[PDB]
Curated annotation (Swiss-Prot), chain D:
Belongs to the bacterial secretin family. PilQ subfamily. Essential for the formation of pili. Involved in the biogenesis of type 4 fimbriae probably by serving as a 'porthole' allowing passage of the fimbrae through the outer membrane. It comes from the Bacteria. This is Fimbrial assembly protein PilQ. The lineage of its organism: Bacteria, Pseudomonadati, Pseudomonadota, Gammaproteobacteria, Pseudomonadales. It is found in: Cell outer membrane. The gene is pilQ.
């Protein structure tokens, strides 16, 4: 986006580089990543809270 | 994503240094017979500044 | 023909066989080595070939990052200001 | 086959054995050393 913004451009890269053996009729997971973000923020006046 | 730093330097030095704030694994596994590995792994979780 | 074993590696093995005590040809395209030499060396190198042409073991490494940050911040500013008698904290 | 020991290290050990008083082959892929030499 910043490149589209003509600022300092951080391009976003998701890349896996590896050498593996598989058969022709075979599908594999070369790589995978699951990002689980859990954020909770509660703002509270003590007595009424 | 790889933030760039364009050290665009007029006199002979053009160093667009660029480094990705990313979740990353760099693995060099060595396998021992009993289904174990001694691996050199660099695991970096870097978030864009 | 050695698919999993580089032909040059086999050539080095045969060189070791020569060290034990003879023509070797290497095919890059097929990674296939043709050797015209005494049968015994042929057979020994073939056995080593069979052992060497073994698939390298891939492993799927799954590393999980768990970050938990808990932040509790409370601030109290208490003010007692009166300009009537000029008392203000 | 030595998984925990580098084959070259074993070759150096055999060289030391030669210093004590004979063909060595090193397999990088398996880290396995094949030696054709006296049994002892």
């Amino acid at each position: 986006y910043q490149n589209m913004l003509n600022g300092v451009p951080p391009i976003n890269k998701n890349e896996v580089n590896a050498k593996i053996l598989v058969n022709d009729g075979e599908t594999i997971v070369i790589g995978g990543v699951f990002s689980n973000e859990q954020s909770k923020s509660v703002e509270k006046v003590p007595f009424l809270g | 994503s790889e933030v760039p730093y364009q050290e665009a330097s007029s006199s002979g030095a053009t160093s667009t240094s660029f480094k990705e704030a990313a979740l990353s694994l760099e693995v060099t596994p060595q396998i021992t017979p009993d289904n174990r590995i001694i691996v050199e792994v660099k695991v970096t979780k870097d978030a864009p500044d | 023909q050695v698919n999993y074993a580089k032909a040059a590696d086999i050539a080095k093995l045969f060189q070791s066989v020569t060290s034990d005590g003879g023509s070797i040809t290497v095919d890059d395209r097929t990674n296939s080595i043709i050797a015209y030499q005494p049968q015994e060396r042929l057979d020994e190198l073939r056995r080593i070939v069979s052992q060497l042409d073994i698939p390298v073991r891939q492993v799927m490494i799954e590393a999980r990052i768990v970050e938990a940050n808990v932040g509790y911040d409370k601030s109290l500013g208490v003010r007692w200001g009166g300009a009537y008698h000029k008392g203000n904290w």
